[PDB]
Every structure is written in structure tokens, then in C-alpha cells.
Amino acid sequence: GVIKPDMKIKLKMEGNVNGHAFVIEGEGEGKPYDGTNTINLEVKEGAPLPFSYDILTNAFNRAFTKYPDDIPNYFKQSFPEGYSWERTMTFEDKGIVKVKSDISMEEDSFIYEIHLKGENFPPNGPVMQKKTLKWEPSTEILYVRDGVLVGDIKHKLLLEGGGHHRVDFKTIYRAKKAVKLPDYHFVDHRIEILNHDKDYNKVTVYESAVARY
């Protein structure tokens, strides 16, 4: 196979949140057919980040999703050419993150080039004052729109103290060649920061994702 059962991950993100510019690079590995991936991440510019690292982690590849055989796999079919995605994250309190990523392949590695811009976050709200705990697990709904694939999620951040903040995600996935398109389906995922240093200059992220009817 062009996609191996064990794939490396290399990525760079250029981002700007509420006017604060930063660059993060990461290297990881995962199991595309098991739906798991792990990435080690270092802030290269812009340290220490003055906002919640959780608004970045979903940006750090649905080729790492476990799919049954009777649902066409839009992401894996796109390789070796790959695919790009554009995402909008609409926060409860009017903050917004717009992110784009290019996913390519180099031998047994996926390569991501990510650009992220967050703005209009309340300066003293939970994202900019780093009061998040994690993303709750959630379920993406995937379906074709306009020939490409769309993913909707109604997400929640768990905050310090136990409350939640809603965040709605819309992603448009665009394969770089014609692929067999799937009927609508769902992807159950979980994402976690496994470890971080004091200011999140060094972070390890883990995600698990499984498609189903």
C-alpha cells in the first residue's frame, strides 16, 4: 500500500491568535488503519503562548481514522496526491478560528502545512486566560456538499471548574483527485494533550477516530 500501517507525521503551523503570532513544529506517528495518531509539538516562535493550547490541537489528518470496508474512505483514497482542508471554529462568545491545512506524503510520512488565525476572542475570557481543561469527546457528521466532503461538529471545551464552552466546527475537505464519494456517516473522536511543560512550549497530542454508520 501507498499508506503504510505505521506512518510518520511532520508538520509546521504558522498561527496568529488575537494579534499574537507564533510558529509550532511537530513530529509524530500513528496507525492509519487503527485510527490513532500522536504528535510531539514545539513552539518555535511566539513563546510563551498567551492563550489556551486547546484551540490548536484539532489542527495538529482524517487519514488517521478507522473505517469499515463498506464506507468509501475519502481521505485514504486521495493519496499519494493528498488533500487539503479548511475549517472554521465558532466559539460561544464570538471568538473565531479559521484554519487551513495541506496534507501531503513523503515516503512513509504525512506532511502538514497549517495556517491558523484566531480573532475576536474576549481578552479576559477562558480561551485567552487559559481556563480550558480539554475537548470533550464528540462525533463529526460527514457528508458530500458540492462534490467535496464536509464535516460538522458541535463541540464543547471543558473549563476549569467543570463548566463548558460550546464551539461549532465546520470543515471542508478537498481531495486532490477524483475519489469515490461516501454517503453520510459519522466519526467518533477523542483528542487529548497527553503532556505539556509549564507554558505548553513542549506538548504531546493524541487523537483517536473511528468512522461508523
Curated annotation (Swiss-Prot):
Contains a chromophore consisting of modified amino acid residues. The chromophore is formed by autocatalytic backbone condensation between Xaa-N and Gly-(N+2), oxidation of Tyr-(N+1) to didehydrotyrosine, and formation of a double bond to the alpha-amino nitrogen of residue Xaa-N. Maturation of the chromophore requires nothing other than molecular oxygen. The precise stereochemistry of the tyrosine has not been determined. Pigment protein that is green in color. GO terms for biological process: bioluminescence; generation of precursor metabolites and energy. Disulfide bonds: none annotated. It comes from Clavularia sp. (Brown star polyp). This is GFP-like fluorescent chromoprotein cFP484. The keyword DNA repair does not apply. It comes from the Eukaryota. The chain holds residues 44 to 259 of 266 of the full protein. Fluorescent proteins have become a useful and ubiquitous tool for making chimeric proteins, where they function as a fluorescent protein tag. Typically they tolerate N- and C-terminal fusion to a broad variety of proteins. They have been expressed in most known cell types and are used as a noninvasive fluorescent marker in living cells and organisms. They enable a wide range of applications where they have functioned as a cell lineage tracer, reporter of gene expression, or as a measure of protein-protein interactions. Tentacle and oral disk. Keywords: Chromophore, Luminescence, Photoprotein. Transmembrane segments: none annotated. Belongs to the GFP family.
